[PDB]
From a paper:
[name] is an ATP-dependent homohexamer that is responsible for substrate recognition and unfolding. [name] is a 95 kDa caseinolytic AAA+ protein with an N-terminal domain ([name]) and two nucleotide-binding domains (D1 and D2). The essential [name]–ClpP1–ClpP2 proteasome complex of Mtb has recently become the focus of several drug-discovery campaigns. The [name] (amino acids 1–145) has been studied extensively to determine the most critical residues for the binding of [name] to several natural cyclopeptides with potent anti-TB activity.
Excluding the four N-terminal residues, the r.m.s.d.s between these two apo structures and that with bound ECU (chain W) are 0.43 and 0.68 Å, respectively, explaining the importance of these structures in solving the large asymmetric unit of the [name]-[name]–ECU complex. In addition, the N-terminus of [name]-[name] maintains a distinct 310-helical structure in the RUF-I and CYMA complexes, rigidified by the covalent bond with Met1, while the N-terminus is more extended in the apo structures and in the ECU complex. In addition, helices 4–5 and 8–9 were shifted by about 3–4 Å owing to a pivot point in the 70s loop. It was observed that one conformation is captured in the apo form and the RUF-I and CYMA complexes, with a second conformation being captured when ECU was bound, in solution or in the ECU-resistant double mutant [name]-[name]-L92S/L96P. Apart from the protein termini, the 70s loop is the most flexible portion of the [name] structures. The region consistently has higher B factors and was more challenging to refine, with unusual orientations of residues. This may reflect the true nature of the protein itself; the mobility of this loop may allow the domain movements that are observed between structures.
Numbering used by the authors: 1 to 152
The structure:
């Protein structure tokens, strides 16, 4: 499905699989996409969360506290959960609502919040990372970057 994904956004979903592997989970949940997103660290999604005053280390610690560590590291491909698949479906819907013709890390963060049930949504809203607030923060951050770039 990942044809519309930017290099950074594909980097997030590859990192989600490796986050599951290292915690000994044989699934990729909303929790592993959120960890892949903060692991990437550089994209509009990580910057959007930091610009709301949220600690990325603090996000990792909150997620890891909830999900714990499985018993046996799995082998090869790790299957997405249906709600993780829903995050990725909603990332596309959020890109269309912003009039973007790409799926960036910022659309994955919106997808994670909009899924509204998982470990990712629970941690994020608890930190004040609500959907309409983050949509506006992503638009404003993109606008702010394009104005700064315009200086060089």
């Amino acid at each position: 499905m990942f044809e519309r994904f930017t290099d950074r956004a594909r980097r997030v979903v590859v990192l989600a699989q490796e986050e599951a592997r290292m915690l000994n989970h044989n699934y990729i949940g909303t929790e592993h996409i959120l960890l892949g997103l903060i692991h990437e660290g550089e994209g509009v999604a990580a910057k959007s969360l930091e610009s709301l005053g949220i600690s990325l280390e603090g996000v990792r610690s909150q997620v890891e506290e909830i999900i714990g560590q499985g018993q046996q590291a799995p082998s090869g491909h790790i299957p997405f959960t249906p709600r993780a698949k829903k995050v990725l479906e909603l990332s596309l819907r959020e890109a269309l609502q912003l009039g973007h013709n790409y799926i960036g890390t910022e659309h994955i963060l919106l997808g994670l919040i909009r899924e509204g049930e998982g470990v990712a949504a629970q941690v994020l809203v608890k930190l004040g990372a609500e959907l309409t607030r983050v949509r506006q923060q992503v638009i404003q951050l993109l606008s702010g970057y394009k104005l700064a770039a315009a200086l060089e």
